[PDB]
Amino acid sequence: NLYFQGADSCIQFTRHASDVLLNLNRLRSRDILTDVVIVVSREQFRAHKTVLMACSGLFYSIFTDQLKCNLSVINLDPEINPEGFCILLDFMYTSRLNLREGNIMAVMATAMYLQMEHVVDTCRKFIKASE
């Protein structure tokens, strides 16, 4: 699937961006070219620094710091919920946010810590609606 757009009339591929993420998530599943371990409450999550930086203000700041960009292990605040992190990491790699009544507060807190503004705002709206 392709279509035209812009004063260019440039060809755009509809599924290209989502296909790239699908493939990045496959690399993560197979531990191919992963270059960082994120440690949350003694659980370990392998990932790609570029994907993290593309989705999170916190990770953008870390991995653009000339000192911290060389670390292969990054520890998060030990009060961060690991399920909250796993939900957001999955979101980064898929566009899908598995928000539920039983996890929304943890996910929101985690998204605030990671500086994922669109997710925070979304959690706020869903909390607002249920009051």
Q: Is 5 helix (H, G, I), strand (E, B) or coil?
A: strand
CB of 27 to ligand 80L, least distance (A): 5
Query: Do 81 and 109 contact (CB within 8 A), yes or no?
Result: yes
CB of 113 to ligand 80L, least distance (A): 29
* 14 interacts with ligand 80L by CB under 6 A: no
What is the x/- site pattern for ligand 80L, positions 27-46, by CB under 6 A? Answer: x--x-x--------------
Distances (CA, A) of 60 to 34, 56, 78, 114: 17, 6, 20, 10
Task: Output b/e per residue, 95-118; b: 16+ Cβ within 10 A.
Answer: eebeeeeeebebbbbbbebbebee
User: What is d(CA 27, CA 34) in angstroms, rounded to the nearest whole number?
Assistant: 8
* 100 interacts with ligand 80L by CB under 6 A: no
CB of 125 to ligand 80L, least distance (A): 34
> Which residue minimizes CB distance to ligand 80L?
26
* 18 interacts with ligand 80L by CB under 6 A: no
Pick the closer one to ligand 80L by CB: 48 or 119. Answer: 48
Residue 124 half-sphere exposure, CB side, CA atoms within 13 Å? Answer: 8
Pick the closer one to ligand 80L by CB: 22 or 127. Answer: 22
Interface residues with ligand 80L (CB under 6 A)? 23, 26-27, 30, 32
